[PDB]
Amino acid sequence: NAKSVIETKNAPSAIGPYSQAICFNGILYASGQIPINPDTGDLVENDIEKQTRQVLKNIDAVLLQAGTTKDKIVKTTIFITNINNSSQVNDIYADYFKGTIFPARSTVEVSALPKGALVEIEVIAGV
Amino acid sequence: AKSVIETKNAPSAIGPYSQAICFNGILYASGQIPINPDTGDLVENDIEKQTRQVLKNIDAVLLQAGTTKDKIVKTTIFITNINNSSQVNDIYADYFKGTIFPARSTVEVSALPKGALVEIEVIAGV
Amino acid sequence: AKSVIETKNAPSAIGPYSQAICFNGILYASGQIPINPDTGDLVENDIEKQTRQVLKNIDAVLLQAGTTKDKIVKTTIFITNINNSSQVNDIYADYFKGTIFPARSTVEVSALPKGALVEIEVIAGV
Ligand SMILES: [Ca+2]
Ligand SMILES: [Ca+2]
Ligand SMILES: [Ca+2]
Numbered sequence: 001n002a003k004s005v006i007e008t009k010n011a012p013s014a015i016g017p018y019s020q021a022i023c024f025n026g027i028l029y030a031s032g033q034i035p036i037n038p039d040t041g042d043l044v045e046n047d048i049e050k051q052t053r054q055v056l057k058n059i060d061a062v063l064l065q066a067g068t069t070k071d072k073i074v075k076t077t078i079f080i081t082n083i084n085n086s087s088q089v090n091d092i093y094a095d096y097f098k099g100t101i102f103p104a105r106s107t108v109e110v111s112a113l114p115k116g117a118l119v120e121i122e123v124i125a126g127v
Numbered sequence: 128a129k130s131v132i133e134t135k136n137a138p139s140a141i142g143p144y145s146q147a148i149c150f151n152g153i154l155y156a157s158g159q160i161p162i163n164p165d166t167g168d169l170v171e172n173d174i175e176k177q178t179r180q181v182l183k184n185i186d187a188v189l190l191q192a193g194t195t196k197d198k199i200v201k202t203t204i205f206i207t208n209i210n211n212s213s214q215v216n217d218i219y220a221d222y223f224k225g226t227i228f229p230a231r232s233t234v235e236v237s238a239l240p241k242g243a244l245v246e247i248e249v250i251a252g253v
Numbered sequence: 254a255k256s257v258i259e260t261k262n263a264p265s266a267i268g269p270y271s272q273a274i275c276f277n278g279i280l281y282a283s284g285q286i287p288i289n290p291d292t293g294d295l296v297e298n299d300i301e302k303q304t305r306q307v308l309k310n311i312d313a314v315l316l317q318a319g320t321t322k323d324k325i326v327k328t329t330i331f332i333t334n335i336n337n338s339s340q341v342n343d344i345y346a347d348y349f350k351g352t353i354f355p356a357r358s359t360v361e362v363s364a365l366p367k368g369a370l371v372e373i374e375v376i377a378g379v
Contacts, residue, residue, distance in 0.1 A: 003326060003378065005353050016338070017346035018357035022326045024378060025278055026151055029327040032358030074129055074148045075155035079360045083238040086142070094143035101131050105144035106158030106248045108205050109238035112335040112361035122329075122358045126129060126150055152277060200255055200274045201281035209364040220269035227257055231270035232284030232374045234331050235364035252255065252276055 001025050008065035011058045012036035015114065021062050023127055028066050032079065032122040033058040034114050043115045048085040052092045055121050060096075063125060070097060072126040075104040079120040083109040089119055134191035137184045138162035147188050149253055154192050158205065158248040159184040160240055169241050174211045177244050178218045185249055197226040198252040205246040209235040215245055262313035264288035273314050275379055280318050284331065284374035285310040286366050295367045300337045304344045307373050315377065323352045324378040331372040335361040341371060 006021035006028070014020060014031070021030040035044045035051035036058070044054045063069055078089060086107060097103070103123070113120050132147035132154070140146055140157065147156040161170050161177035162184065170180045189195055206215060212233060223229070229249070239246045258273035259266070263285070266272050273282040287296040287303035288310070296306045315321055330341060338359060349355070355375070365372050 003324065003353060014354075016342045016357070016359070017349060017354050019354045020356070022353070022356045024326045027326075029356040029376070031356045032360075072129070074150045076144075077358075079358070083240065086240065090142045097143055101129060101148070102140070102143050102145045104146070104148045104155045104157045105142070106203075106205070106246065107142070107240055108158075108236045108246065110360045111237055111363050114335070114338065114359055120358065120360065124155075198255065200276045207363075209366070212366065216268055223269050227255060227274070228266070228269045228271045230272070230274045230281045230283040232329075232331075232372065233366055234284075234362045234372065237363040250281065 006062055006066050008061055010038055010061035012038045012041065021066060023066060026127050028068060028125040028127055030059060030062050030123045032120040034117040034120050043117060046118065048088045048118050049092060051118050052089045055119060056093065056096045059121060059123055066127060068125050068127055071100045073103045073123050074125060076121055076123045078105065078107040079110045079113060080107065081110060081113060081118050085118060132188055132192045134187055136164060136187035136191065138164045139167065147192060149192060152253050154194060154251040154253050156185065156188050156249045158246040160243040160246050162241065169243060174214050174244050175218060178215050181245055181247050182222045185247065189251060192253060194251050194253050196223065199229045199249050200252060201230040201250045203248045204231065204233040205236050205239060207236060207239060207244050211244065258314055258318045260313050260317035262290055263310045264290050273318060275318060278379055280320055280377040280379055282311065282314050282375045284372040286369040286372050295369060298370060300340050300370050301344060303370050304341050307371055308348050311373065311375055318379060320377050320379050322349060325355045325375050326378065327356045327376045329374045330357065330359040331362045331365060332359065333362065333365055333370050337370060
């Protein structure tokens with residue numbers, strides 16, 4: 001249960017002094033994921049739907065490397081640069097979480113995100 | 128395993144989220160905005176009225192989970208106007224009077240769901 | 254079971270909040286802004302001085318709680334200018350040298366308490 005690191009080449013390499021996720025006392029604390037394609041290191045196109053899809057795939061990669069799944073996510077925070085993009089984010093986020101007990105959640109409009117991203121999603125999960 | 132909290136005394140979750148999730152003895156509440164649960168609409172565009180509603184909604188979630196506000200360990204206050212901090216704080220202080228005050232973070236954001244002026248997220252012991 | 258952390262070497266908790274709460278083996282720290290506890294006033298608008306003051310304040314909380322920065326699992330960095338990310342990162346990296354870096358999220362918010370450039374919230378094992 002002591003603090004352990006999660007590292008996978010299937011999620012973006014850390015672009016700063018942080019770990020992709022930390023497991024501790026049965027909780028996986030994921031870094032906020034932005035819409036970087038892990039294979040190229042580039043932000044995907046300036047399109048909220050494509051970016052939401054990329055973020056959720058990056059989160060999934062972190063969960064898999066930790067040996068857990070999206071069904072175990074307890075709580076998320078959505079940081080978006082335009083509150084009017086909430087519905088398009090929700091429409092895809094729901095697809096990802098369909099059939100699970102939906103996590104608790106907060107959504108707020110931020111003024112800017114790393115690399116000019118439109119959305120960043122942070123999750124905590126059970127291990 | 129995680130378990131859901133659902134009560135008609137708190138605003139219906141529209142987006143693909145649960146009002147709160149309990150896991151390993153901790154209640155993770157969704158951020159509450161100043162919705163009247165009976166209508167789904169925000170209350171008046173007044174920071175004091177909205178803060179009061181948020182806290183009522185939080186109370187309803189805690190009660191359904193079988194816990195209380197004195198078990199809250201940490202909150203985050205998201206407000207659209209940092210100049211409203213004093214008014215939010217005084218109502219928040221009255222809500223927590225007589226308890227060990229939670230840890231807290233406060234930030235100003237440029238917008239909130241439904242055009243709310245305030246959104247408060249809490250974590251509690253169950 | 255929840256317990257308060259209080260130290261005169263972090264900014265006085267004016268009003269309804271605790272500097273940090275410990276519960277079930279986790280330290281939930283309040284977000285720290287660059288108030289100098291020696292003066293009670295905010296540090297000048299130099300992102301490096303403010304980031305160092307924030308980390309000094311976090312250090313004081315960890316010390317009083319009987320834990321260390323090696324046990325931090327997650328931080329959130331709220332900044333008023335995303336262009337300050339690099340300067341914050343370099344200081345934050347020196348701070349965490351020799352530890353497994355925490356999980357993290359960094360976002361630019363519309364404003365912070367007292368007009369601060371940076372607020373950092375941490376979660377740690379006790
Ligand atoms: Ca859909
Ligand atoms: Ca200790
Ligand atoms: Ca900016």
